[PDB]
Amino acid sequence: TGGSSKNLGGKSPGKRFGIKKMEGHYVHAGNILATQRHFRWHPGAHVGLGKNKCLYALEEGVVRYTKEVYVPNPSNSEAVDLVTRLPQGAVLYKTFVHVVPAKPEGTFKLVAML
Amino acid sequence: SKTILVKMMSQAGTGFSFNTKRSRLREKLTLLHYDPVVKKKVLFVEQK
Amino acid sequence: GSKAVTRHRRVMHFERQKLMAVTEY
RNA sequence: GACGAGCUACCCAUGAGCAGUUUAAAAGAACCAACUCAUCUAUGUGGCAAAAUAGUGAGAAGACUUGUAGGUAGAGGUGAAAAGCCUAACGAGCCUGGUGAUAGCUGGUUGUCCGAGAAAGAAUUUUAGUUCAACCUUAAAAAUACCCCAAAAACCCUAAAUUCCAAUGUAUUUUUAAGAGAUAGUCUAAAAAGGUACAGCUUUUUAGAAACGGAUACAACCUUGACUAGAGAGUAAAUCUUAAUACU
RNA sequence: UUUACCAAAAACAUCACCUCUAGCAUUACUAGUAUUAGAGGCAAUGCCUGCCCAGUGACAAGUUUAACGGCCGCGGUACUGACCGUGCAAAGGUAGCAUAAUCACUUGUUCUCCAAAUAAGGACUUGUAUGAAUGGCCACACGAGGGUUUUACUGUCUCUU
RNA sequence: ACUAUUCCAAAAGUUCUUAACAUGGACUAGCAAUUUCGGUUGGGGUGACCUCGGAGUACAAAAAACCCUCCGAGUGAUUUUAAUCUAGACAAACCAGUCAAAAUAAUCACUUAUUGAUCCAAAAUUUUGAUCAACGGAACAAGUUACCCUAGGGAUAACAGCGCAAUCCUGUUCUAGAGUUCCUAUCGACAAUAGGGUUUACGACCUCGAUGUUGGAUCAGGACACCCAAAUGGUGCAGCCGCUAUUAAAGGUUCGUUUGUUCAACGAUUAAAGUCCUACGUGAUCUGAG
Ligand SMILES: [Mg+2]
Ligand SMILES: [Mg+2]
Ligand SMILES: [Mg+2]
Ligand SMILES: [Mg+2]
Ligand SMILES: [Mg+2]
Ligand SMILES: [Mg+2]
Ligand SMILES: [Mg+2]
Ligand SMILES: [Mg+2]
Ligand SMILES: [Mg+2]
Ligand SMILES: [Mg+2]
Ligand SMILES: [Mg+2]
Ligand SMILES: [Mg+2]
Ligand SMILES: [Mg+2]
Ligand SMILES: [Mg+2]
Ligand SMILES: [Mg+2]
Ligand SMILES: [Mg+2]
Ligand SMILES: [Mg+2]
Ligand SMILES: [Mg+2]
Ligand SMILES: [Mg+2]
Ligand SMILES: [Mg+2]
Ligand SMILES: [Mg+2]
Ligand SMILES: [Mg+2]
Ligand SMILES: [Mg+2]
Ligand SMILES: [Mg+2]
Ligand SMILES: [Mg+2]
Ligand SMILES: [Mg+2]
Ligand SMILES: [Mg+2]
Ligand SMILES: [Mg+2]
Ligand SMILES: [Mg+2]
Ligand SMILES: [Mg+2]
Ligand SMILES: [Mg+2]
Ligand SMILES: [Mg+2]
Ligand SMILES: [Mg+2]
Ligand SMILES: [Mg+2]
Ligand SMILES: [Mg+2]
Ligand SMILES: [Mg+2]
Ligand SMILES: [Mg+2]
Ligand SMILES: [Mg+2]
Ligand SMILES: [Mg+2]
Ligand SMILES: [Mg+2]
Ligand SMILES: [Mg+2]
Ligand SMILES: [Mg+2]
Ligand SMILES: [Mg+2]
Ligand SMILES: [Mg+2]
Ligand SMILES: [Mg+2]
Ligand SMILES: [Mg+2]
Ligand SMILES: [Mg+2]
Ligand SMILES: [Mg+2]
Ligand SMILES: [Mg+2]
Ligand SMILES: [Mg+2]
Ligand SMILES: [Mg+2]
Ligand SMILES: [Mg+2]
Ligand SMILES: [Mg+2]
Ligand SMILES: [Mg+2]
Ligand SMILES: [Mg+2]
Ligand SMILES: [Mg+2]
Ligand SMILES: [Mg+2]
Ligand SMILES: [Mg+2]
Ligand SMILES: [Mg+2]
Ligand SMILES: [Mg+2]
Ligand SMILES: [Mg+2]
Ligand SMILES: [Mg+2]
Ligand SMILES: [Mg+2]
Ligand SMILES: [Mg+2]
Ligand SMILES: [Mg+2]
Ligand SMILES: [Mg+2]
Ligand SMILES: [Mg+2]
Known part of the structure; x- marks a missing residue:
């Protein structure tokens, strides 16, 4: 019996999209936080x-x-x-990510006393 | 239709660009590009 | 293995049958 | 690379047989012996015999049978082609070398006693195999590891639940150096597909299991985890029960 | 004549008929010389052997089928189709024979044969997958070939002793 | 290689030739060599597919299968030519893939997919090369084998068993309808619910260091879902035949023509010439027509 199934190429790997770091995670400059399509x-x-x-x-x-x-x-x-067509009372909301800086920006060191 | 690989030549020195072009030739290839030696913005001319 | 819904009335795992006999009205 | 045509295939030499009967006849004519074949049946099947015996059959002066002696040799010979025959296995002889050929394929692999212990993610002329990852074993160095309350992870509808983290209960986990096996799984519960809302069916995801005790019997269900002695004790799962009537 | 040891046949050979290839001397052919000798086909005899050089060959562009091999549609019309149209081909399967040792349908149809026959023989017959030297068709004579009937005979068997 | 062919050189001579040997390089054939004949698969063949991306399956971190269900890509269209060098990262067996601060001086087409590793080749100053599509890619190999051979496998088919019961097979439940009138004498659409395990399938669970496979012969063991014989209910049963239903397995259940045939037709009869199972009973009893 002819067994042809007409469908092709269902197969892809997953792209591992999703959230890499979680709320309250420590982070260094350059870390990818989340990746989404x-x-x-x-x-x-x-x-x-x-x-x-x-x-x-x-x-x-x-x-x-x-x-x-x-x-x-x-x-x-x-x-x-x-944004234009919304009824006059409503505003739009979204989810954001943030980094909250830990290290202070700098320090004043005494180099030389002349 | 087809895609032609063309090699661009800079006015000055040995700098050579490689890029693709269209069969129908919408826009003939002449560029303003970056030369490393003189560290400059240049006119690159389509060549083979 | 038999599907979640079937017509042959689907024999229950023994621990669940005991569970049944305990909770009768 | 040798050795084989004393069997058989075909030739070359040199010999030898063919009675009777019928017909003008030695005429690939009749009949029927010797002689040659092997049709058909039954015996026989570690036989009397690695192909026979008993009956019964075809041919029987011819393309006939048969003796002695030569010849052709395996990438070949010979063939009235059956891919026949060439020394009791010929789709290509036998022997000795190459040769401990090569087998991801079977089959085997030898004393005792202790520690710890594994189930299939990738690629692959790959799916009977390998080589990487993950788990794991043997050493070492260290620091945190599981568990984990708020808080937090999407836009229409969307359950069981995940991910992530202090406290806390515990002792585990990560790295470094060496190593393999394993990578052909079964069923039970749950979520789904395919099939017939069928399989002791097949395909994934999350759990469990593989008692010497129960379910008589029993691989997967249930109780339990483990040693060695006792002619002690307490318990665990479990023994199988349930029923049904009149109309004046 | 053959599968020594599971197949003796319808297989092979063969008289005959045809194709090719050869103009010549010391070891074959051959002490031969084209009425001869080598490669082959198909199988006596009788009647026959249709059309096809486009492919592949082979030969010395052209030529060849007794070389390998091929030999049709679609619809319209007197239930049919002698006729008609148009298409494609290198040609369009003819003479025969036919349900066949011929894919299937399929136990084709019908007659004869028996009390009864999917057997046998005779006919019809598009066989859409027969068919003329990969031979087509009849016929003597011959088969330890296959099939069918009759006579006769009997322990095959009724049904054993 | 060889056997022949044709040609050019060589060799001899002529001023263009080849008597027989005979070497170098070609050509054109014959005879002939060497080597292979991809993989997935609900056994293999035929059919279909083999890399890359969006959905579902996979509902809310990731991952996640099928010869699962559905849509796509092996590039276009522009302009603005979209640069160097280096922290930290995602992803990941590996190979490949991804973002990117500081420091110097590409967009639209659901946008996500538009792509091929080494080696080897050509190129210039630096880089381009594949239906290698079997898409992690052998520099270049097809058919057959019933003449077959070895190594294995019940890891996988054909026979038989087992599982399941789609199909098949026996019951009942429901009355529209047929039955002139009358549902249920005899039946009964659309439908409900139980069973049986012989059919054709479907699974691949035991056997491939053999469970020898159709039909007959002989001898039968069993079921009852009775074909006869035996008791009975109902009838659209006057009687004779009948047609249905209930209870009953001790005993029976023929001989022929054609087919290898079970089946079937047909001749002749019988009280009847049952339906089945038993490894489609039975080959260390027989027969092989198939
Ligand atoms: Mg997907
Ligand atoms: Mg995937
Ligand atoms: Mg290119
Ligand atoms: Mg000799
Ligand atoms: Mg001899
Ligand atoms: Mg005589
Ligand atoms: Mg004679
Ligand atoms: Mg006798
Ligand atoms: Mg005689
Ligand atoms: Mg005679
Ligand atoms: Mg002979
Ligand atoms: Mg032959
Ligand atoms: Mg043969
Ligand atoms: Mg021998
Ligand atoms: Mg060895
Ligand atoms: Mg490969
Ligand atoms: Mg293997
Ligand atoms: Mg923590
Ligand atoms: Mg398996
Ligand atoms: Mg494996
Ligand atoms: Mg069961
Ligand atoms: Mg598990
Ligand atoms: Mg016990
Ligand atoms: Mg203890
Ligand atoms: Mg002989
Ligand atoms: Mg023989
Ligand atoms: Mg014989
Ligand atoms: Mg002949
Ligand atoms: Mg002549
Ligand atoms: Mg003739
Ligand atoms: Mg002719
Ligand atoms: Mg005609
Ligand atoms: Mg026929
Ligand atoms: Mg024909
Ligand atoms: Mg011919
Ligand atoms: Mg013919
Ligand atoms: Mg004669
Ligand atoms: Mg004869
Ligand atoms: Mg005869
Ligand atoms: Mg070699
Ligand atoms: Mg293959
Ligand atoms: Mg395969
Ligand atoms: Mg298949
Ligand atoms: Mg299967
Ligand atoms: Mg195919
Ligand atoms: Mg910057
Ligand atoms: Mg290349
Ligand atoms: Mg491949
Ligand atoms: Mg691949
Ligand atoms: Mg890949
Ligand atoms: Mg044959
Ligand atoms: Mg073998
Ligand atoms: Mg099996
Ligand atoms: Mg059997
Ligand atoms: Mg079976
Ligand atoms: Mg069995
Ligand atoms: Mg059932
Ligand atoms: Mg089934
Ligand atoms: Mg399985
Ligand atoms: Mg077997
Ligand atoms: Mg055995
Ligand atoms: Mg009986
Ligand atoms: Mg009864
Ligand atoms: Mg009986
Ligand atoms: Mg049997
Ligand atoms: Mg039998
Ligand atoms: Mg027996």
Whole structure:
């Protein structure tokens, strides 16, 4: 009996998208925080956005997650319109990641007393 | 249609770029690129 | 192995049958 | 690389047989012996015999049978092609070398007693195999390891639950140096697929198990984890029960 | 004539008929010389042997099938189709024979044969997968070949002694 | 290689030739050599697929199978030519993949997929080369074997057993309907619920250091879902035949023509010429037509 199943190429590995660090994790500058294919979490304070929508930590610190108000860039039109048609009482919210800096910025050392 | 690999030549020195071009030739290839030796912005000309 | 829903009435694991006989009305 | 045509295939020499009967006849004619074959049946099957015996059959002056002696030799010979025959196994002889050929494939692998102990993620002319990872064993160095309350992880609907962490209960875990085996699993509960809401069915994910005690019997279900002695004790799972009536 | 030791046949050979290839001397052929000698095909005899050089060959572009091999549609019309149209081919399967030692349907149809026959023989017959030297068709004479009937005979068997 | 062919050199001579030997390099054939004939697979063959990405399966960190269910890619379209060098990271068997601060001076097409490792080749100053698509890629190899051979496997088929019961097979439950009227004498659509384990399948669980496989012969053991004989209910049963249903397994259940045939047709009869199971009973009893 002809057993042809017409479907092809279901097979891909998973991309291991997801959250790499968790709230209250210590982080060094450069660590990737989470990696996603669509924006699930947006970059907050001290979190840089990679061209593939990676989130990495800019400072040395503690990673925090947050629900905050979303005010799209006036250059990006779709989001501008989505913001436009809302009923007059409602604001948009999203989830952000943050780094909270640990090390102080610097120190004043006494080099020489002349 | 096809894709042609073309080798660009800089005005000055031995700097050589390699890039791809279109069969239909939408935009003929002439570039402003970066030369390492003089550390400059250059005019690169399409060659073979 | 038999599916979660079946028509042949599906014999229960013994520990669960005891569980049944204990909780009767 | 030797040795084999004393069997058999075909030739070359040199010899030898063929009675009777019928027909003008030695005519690949009749009939029927010797002689040659091997049809059909039954015996026989470690036989009388590594192919026979008894009956019964075909041919029987011819492409006939048969004796002695030569010849052709294996990448070959010979063949009225059956891929036949070439010394009791010929789709390619036998022997001695190469030769302890080579077998991811079977089959075997020898004293005692103790420690610790494994179930399949990748690639692969790969799925009967290897080589990496993970687990693990033997040494070493160290510091935290499991457990883990808030807090936290998405946008329409979305259960059991995960991930991540102090306290706390414990002693485990990570690195370094050496190593292998293993990588052909079964069922039971749960979530799903495929099939017939079928399999002692197949395909993944999460758990369990493989008692000398129970379920008589029993691999996977249930009770228990472990040593050596006692003609002591307490317990565990478990022994199998349940039923059903009138209309005036 | 053959599978010594599971197959003697329808297989092979063979008279006959045809294709090729050869113009010549010391060891074969051959002490031969084209009416001869080598490679082969197909199997006497009788009647026959249709059309096809486009492919692959082979020969010395062209030529060849008694070389390897091939030898049709689709619809319209007097239930049928002599006719008709158009397409493709190198040609379009003819003479025969036919349910067959011929894919299947399939135990084709019908007659004869028996009390009864999926057997046997005779016919019809598109065999859509027969068919003419990979030979087609009839016929003597011959088979330890296969099948069918009859006579006769009997322990095959009724059914054993 | 050889046997032949054709040619060019060589060799001899002529001013272009080849008598027989005979070497170098070609050519064109015959005879002939050497080596292979990928893999997944609900046995193998035929069919289909082999890398890469989106969904589902896999519901909320990751991962996650099938010859699972569905859509895609082996590139286009531009302009703005999208640079060096180095912290820390994701991912990961490995190989490949990914982000990226500081320091110097690409976009749209669901956007995610648009791609091939070494070696070896060509190139210039530096780099380009594959339906290597069997897509971790052998520099280049197909058919057959019933003439077959070895090593293995019940890790895997054919026979038989077992599992399951789709199909098949016996019951009942429901009355629309047939039955002129009348559901249930005899039946009965659409449907419900139990069973049986012979069929064709489906699984691959025992056997491949052999469980010898169809039909007959002989001899039968068993079931009862009775074909006869024996008791009975109902009838659209007057009687004769009948048609249905209940109870009953001690005993029976023919001889022929054609087929290897069980089946089936057909002749002739019988009280009847049952349906089955037993390794489709029975080959260390027989027969091999198949
Ligand atoms: Mg997927
Ligand atoms: Mg995958
Ligand atoms: Mg290219
Ligand atoms: Mg001799
Ligand atoms: Mg001799
Ligand atoms: Mg005589
Ligand atoms: Mg004679
Ligand atoms: Mg006798
Ligand atoms: Mg005689
Ligand atoms: Mg005679
Ligand atoms: Mg002979
Ligand atoms: Mg032959
Ligand atoms: Mg043969
Ligand atoms: Mg011998
Ligand atoms: Mg060895
Ligand atoms: Mg390979
Ligand atoms: Mg292997
Ligand atoms: Mg912790
Ligand atoms: Mg297995
Ligand atoms: Mg393995
Ligand atoms: Mg069971
Ligand atoms: Mg497990
Ligand atoms: Mg016991
Ligand atoms: Mg103890
Ligand atoms: Mg003989
Ligand atoms: Mg013989
Ligand atoms: Mg014989
Ligand atoms: Mg003949
Ligand atoms: Mg002539
Ligand atoms: Mg003739
Ligand atoms: Mg002709
Ligand atoms: Mg005709
Ligand atoms: Mg026929
Ligand atoms: Mg024909
Ligand atoms: Mg011919
Ligand atoms: Mg023919
Ligand atoms: Mg004659
Ligand atoms: Mg004869
Ligand atoms: Mg005869
Ligand atoms: Mg060699
Ligand atoms: Mg293959
Ligand atoms: Mg295979
Ligand atoms: Mg298959
Ligand atoms: Mg199977
Ligand atoms: Mg195929
Ligand atoms: Mg910068
Ligand atoms: Mg290349
Ligand atoms: Mg491969
Ligand atoms: Mg591969
Ligand atoms: Mg890969
Ligand atoms: Mg044969
Ligand atoms: Mg063998
Ligand atoms: Mg098995
Ligand atoms: Mg059997
Ligand atoms: Mg079976
Ligand atoms: Mg058995
Ligand atoms: Mg059942
Ligand atoms: Mg089934
Ligand atoms: Mg299995
Ligand atoms: Mg076996
Ligand atoms: Mg044995
Ligand atoms: Mg009996
Ligand atoms: Mg009864
Ligand atoms: Mg009886
Ligand atoms: Mg039997
Ligand atoms: Mg039998
Ligand atoms: Mg027996």
